[PDB]
Design a protein around this ligand. Structure first.
Ligand SMILES: *[C@@H]1O[C@H](CO)[C@@H](O[C@@H]2O[C@H](CO)[C@@H](O[C@@H]3O[C@H](CO[C@H]4O[C@H](CO)[C@@H](O)[C@H](O[C@H]5O[C@H](CO)[C@@H](O)[C@H](O)[C@@H]5O[C@H]5O[C@H](CO)[C@@H](O)[C@H](O)[C@@H]5O)[C@@H]4O)[C@@H](O)[C@H](O[C@H]4O[C@H](CO)[C@@H](O)[C@H](O)[C@@H]4O[C@H]4O[C@H](CO)[C@@H](O)[C@H](O)[C@@H]4O)[C@@H]3O)[C@H](O)[C@H]2NC(C)=O)[C@H](O)[C@H]1NC(C)=O
Ligand SMILES: Cc1cc(COc2n[nH]c3c2CCN(C(=O)c2ccc(S(N)(=O)=O)cc2)CC3)c(C(C)(C)C)cc1Cl
Ligand SMILES: Cc1cc(COc2n[nH]c3c2CCN(C(=O)c2ccc(S(N)(=O)=O)cc2)CC3)c(C(C)(C)C)cc1Cl
Ligand SMILES: [Ca+2]
Ligand SMILES: [Ca+2]
Ligand SMILES: [Cl-]
Ligand SMILES: [K+]
Ligand code: NA
Ligand SMILES: [Zn+2]
Length: 789
């Protein structure tokens, strides 16, 4: 570039220029392309950041970092404390909270601006634990809308989380799957240090600044160069807010590398952390004071958000793969608070993923990581459908690291990156301004949801993303998004009695009419039938104790719904009943399973969706053993499922005052988080067309007010759900030799899920017929029961 050009009149210009011009935008530094005089003109520091009484009314000196002259407000370049020191005004933090019912903006503003104030490593518990030293942040939190915590995405690192904030996408979809990555298609490596990360090919989706710009709404920079001091970042935003109407952005971002930087050195709660928290709070105060001087403090919506939390982690708490693998030199590891393994050489024909997994599985009693093939990771992590994610993954216990060899580890006392349900990884959310609610607490929610909300705040249509638009309506005073329930694509058949017993050849070892036309359906289907959102052929089957949507294409239920009261009795299941699976006279032989395929398949057995253990009556129990209630299950998985059905369902009914359960299969052989089509299924029961699920789900709903039984609930609902992997072993559960009471519940907690996760995986839409607002239901569908204290 012709660096001999000048930044005079151009400092922090919003639109980058190309060669031969030199640049004065904030990215110039990152591209070594700033005009020669950029530091001199654009990064002024003279006299620091604060007006003093002696400077009030000064003649303007262009060398100063900020101004205390009479003309500074119209120029938009006063120091943030100018009006306090020189005009007897109060600091924003010292003013009482006053509800902001409507935007109170200068003429020419067409919408309230949005400022995203992002703090790296701001762990959720800082809001309480640091309260005495963060009065500005505490005022935003108490006066605005806040959650107790916000859940990050996995991995709980900066780049994946900030880019999720910007796009509404899971890392597997936006592509920023770690702070370090290898892309095999491009044969390229992304690192925190170096130039490859600047290549646009890494950054997928459509970030908020693009969404805005394409829709005619101007944006400030999102990236801030490390060397631009925070006070200059703030002053820059405030100068941009003073631009003419057709030049001024509507969306802005601030980023702070604190408290993360100090948290890595000192741990999350090291005594050294107080000062960083005070410093960040000071910066918030600068911004708020600056807005108040500009008459924008009741105009702009401020989002105070972190990217992830921070855990205690030390060099000694490192597991070494060289203690497990004889062949450690044949692998490449992406190390730390997660592990990702691939072959060092793609020409090495002796590398074998299975052997690596086996050598890493339950080898030391206290082992502080667990290996997975990525498709076997908990589905809630949504961490598999990208070629940048290695097939072999190590989920590392909180407080630990993994490394390849001890020499890699020859400082830090804090780190992050762990599973996003871990409490130490949670972060913060506050929204303050005219469009957010006043003095309102909202439940915890996921950061994937925020893109849609920022688009709502800006009048933008969001690009397609992984939020559930409307699930955060309860944060907002205005600009809610009101969607319609998706249209049902396939209508059910309602078959009657159409086949005689002797038409079947199952190969098994061997008022009723009111219940078959759906007379207890009100009790067992409490929220309406699920809607099927794709083209298929299915049947609704009614029974005294349960209702099902039976797929003629997959030869099993898509869903099975049943209600269990607090007083339900559990009964024995003798094996002669399990062996004598009965034809369903409503469903053709051709569209049914059989016992022979199971007898022939030495690896596959079967279970039942409605639990025979919880049958209400003799008439009713026969229904539990219908061929249309059977599902393929490996013997190892039947241990898990039997415990859930025999012990856990009744325990949850007792605790919750009844539960409604919807269970069913999931097929996701391509690990994309989406329902498989029939032609994607990789495994059948031997000699048959009976497809093998990759997972089994259950959605367990009750009354939020547990004084009301689940079947007579007048108000909001409570849900917990799971997506259990259908595996042929229990190798994931290192204590699985013990009784199920010692390991199954732990496995289930790990595989906790949102209803929305199940919806993606099944093409079903739940909760169609409740008494509740649709936005309330969408929030319910995004809920995750995390099992953390
Ligand atoms: C979370 O939300 C996101 C956003 O809604 C959901 O992701 C979408 O899911 C769709 C289904 O998986 C997917 O749709 C496919 O789009 C293809 C066009 O894709 C390009 O163009 C779009 C639009 O501008 C762009 O967004 C895409 O961006 C991806 O790829 C670039 C690299 O080019 C990456 O930088 C970027 O990060 C992003 O990667 C992510 O998605 C790709 C898949 O697109 C993954 O490979 C990555 O790992 C990463 O996850 C692209 O630039 C389109 O071509 C597809 O159509 C084919 O396949 C379907 C199969 O059902 C079929 O109907 C079509 O006929 C067609 O078939 C032909 O191609 C097949 C595949 O090669 C072939 O085998 C057949 O024989 C046929 O010839 C399909 O429509 C959409 O791209 C993504 N969007 C994003 C941003 O990720 C996501 O599902 C949500 N998650 C959950 C769990 O709900
Ligand atoms: C609001 C918002 C802001 C930004 C800008 O964010 C940044 N501006 N400037 C820096 C950043 C972050 C990275 N970075 C780091 O120093 C860093 C720090 C810790 C870790 S670690 N180790 O804690 O994970 C890893 C990297 C360099 C400085 C973005 C984008 C997407 C543009 C990044 C999106 C949004 Cl929505
Ligand atoms: C895509 C991407 C690239 C890079 C490399 O660097 C950049 N190259 N090109 C841009 C960036 C930074 C991000 N970025 C902005 O912050 C921005 C700038 C101007 C306006 S504007 N023009 O609307 O005012 C709005 C937003 C868009 C442009 C990074 C890292 C983190 C590696 C820096 C992160 C990302 Cl997500
Ligand atoms: Ca020029
Ligand atoms: Ca799939
Ligand atoms: Cl990483
Ligand atoms: K078998
Ligand atoms: Na085991
Ligand atoms: Zn960090």
């Amino acid at each position: 570039t012709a660096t001999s050009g000048s930044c005079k009149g151009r400092c922090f210009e919003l639109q980058e220029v190309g060669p031969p011009d030199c640049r004065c935008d904030n990215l110039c530094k990152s591209y070594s392309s700033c005009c020669h005089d950029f530091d001199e003109l654009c990064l002024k520091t003279a006299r620091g950041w604060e007006c003093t009484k002696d400077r009030c009314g000064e003649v303007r000196n262009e060398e100063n970092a900020c101004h205390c002259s009479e003309d500074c407000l119209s120029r938009g370049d006063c120091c943030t404390n100018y009006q306090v020191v020189c005009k007897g005004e109060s600091h924003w933090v010292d003013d009482d909270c006053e509800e902001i019912k409507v935007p109170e903006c200068p003429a020419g503003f067409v919408r309230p601006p949005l400022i995203i104030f992002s703090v790296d490593g701001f762990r959720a518990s800082y809001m309480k634990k640091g309260s005495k030293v963060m009065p500005n942040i505490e005022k935003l939190r108490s006066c605005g809308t806040h959650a107790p915590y916000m859940r990050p995405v996995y991995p709980t690192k900066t780049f994946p989380n900030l880019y999720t904030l910007a796009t509404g996408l899971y890392p597997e979809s936006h592509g920023i799957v770690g702070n370090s990555m290898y892309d095999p298609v491009f044969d390229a490596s992304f690192h925190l240090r170096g130039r490859e990360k600047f290549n646009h090919r890494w950054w997928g989706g459509q970030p908020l600044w693009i969404t805005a710009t394409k829709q005619g709404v101007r944006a400030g920079t999102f990236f801030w160069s490390v060397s631009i001091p925070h006070e200059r970042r703030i002053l820059t935003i405030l100068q941009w807010l003073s631009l003419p109407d057709n030049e001024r952005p509507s969306v802005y971002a601030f980023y702070s590398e604190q408290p993360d930087f100090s948290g890595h050195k000192y741990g999350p709660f090291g005594p050294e952390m107080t000062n960083p928290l005070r410093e960040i709070d000071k910066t918030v105060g600068q911004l708020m004071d600056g807005l108040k001087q500009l008459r924008l403090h009741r105009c702009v919506n401020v989002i105070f958000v972190g990217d992830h939390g921070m855990e205690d982690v030390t060099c000694d708490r490192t597991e070494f793969l060289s203690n497990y693998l004889t062949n450690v030199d044949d692998i490449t590891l992406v190390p730390g608070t997660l592990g990702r393994i691939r072959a060092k050489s793609i020409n090495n024909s002796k590398y074998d993923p299975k052997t690596i997994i086996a050598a890493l599985t339950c080898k030391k009693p206290d082992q502080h990581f667990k290996p997975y093939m990525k498709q076997h990771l908990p589905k809630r992590l949504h961490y598999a459908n990208n070629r940048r994610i290695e097939d072999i993954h190590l989920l590392v216990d909180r407080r630990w690291h993994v490394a390849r060899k001890p020499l890699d580890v020859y400082f830090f006392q804090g780190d992050h990156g762990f599973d996003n349900k871990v409490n130490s990884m949670q972060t913060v959310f506050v929204g303050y301004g005219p469009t957010f609610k006043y003095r309102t607490k909202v439940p915890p929610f996921e950061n994937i949801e925020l893109y849609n909300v920022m688009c709502d705040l800006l009048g933008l249509k969001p690009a397609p993303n992984n939020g559930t638009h409307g699930s955060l309506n309860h944060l907002l005073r205005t600009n809610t998004f009101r969607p319609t329930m998706p249209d049902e694509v396939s209508r059910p058949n309602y078959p009657g009695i159409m086949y005689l017993q002797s038409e079947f050849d199952l190969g098994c070892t061997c008022n009723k009419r009111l219940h078959t036309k759906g007379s207890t359906k009100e009790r067992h289907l409490l929220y309406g039938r699920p809607a099927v959102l794709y083209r298929t052929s299915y049947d609704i089957l009614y029974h005294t104790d349960f209702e099902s949507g039976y797929s003629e294409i997959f030869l099993m239920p898509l869903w099975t719904s049943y209600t269990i009261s607090k007083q339900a009795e559990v009964s024995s299941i003798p094996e002669h009943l399990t062996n004598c699976v009965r034809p369903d006279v409503r469903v053709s032989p051709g569209f049914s399973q059989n016992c022979l395929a199971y007898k022939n398949d030495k690896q596959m057995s079967y279970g039942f969706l409605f639990p025979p253990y919880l049958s209400s009556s003799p008439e009713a129990k026969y229904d539990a053993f219908l061929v249309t209630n059977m599902v393929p299950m490996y013997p190892a998985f039947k241990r898990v499922w039997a415990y859930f059905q025999r012990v856990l369902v009744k325990k949850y009914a007792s605790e919750r005052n009844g539960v409604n359960v919807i269970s069913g299969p999931i097929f996701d052989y391509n690990y994309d988080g989406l329902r498989d089509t029939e032609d994607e299924i990789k495994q059948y029961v031997e000699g048959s067309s009976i497809p093998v699920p990759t997972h089994y789900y259950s959605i367990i709903t009750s009354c939020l007010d547990f004084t009301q039984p689940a079947d007579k609930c007048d108000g909001p609902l409570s849900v917990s759900s799971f997506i259990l992997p259908h595996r042929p072993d229990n190798d994931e559960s290192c204590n699985s030799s013990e009784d199920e009471s010692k390991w199954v519940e732990e496995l289930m907690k790990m595989h906790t899920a949102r209803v929305r996760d199940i919806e993606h995986l099944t093409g079903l839409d739940f909760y169609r017929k409740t008494s509740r607002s649709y936005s309330e239901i969408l929030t319910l569908k995004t809920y995750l029961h995390t099992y953390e204290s």
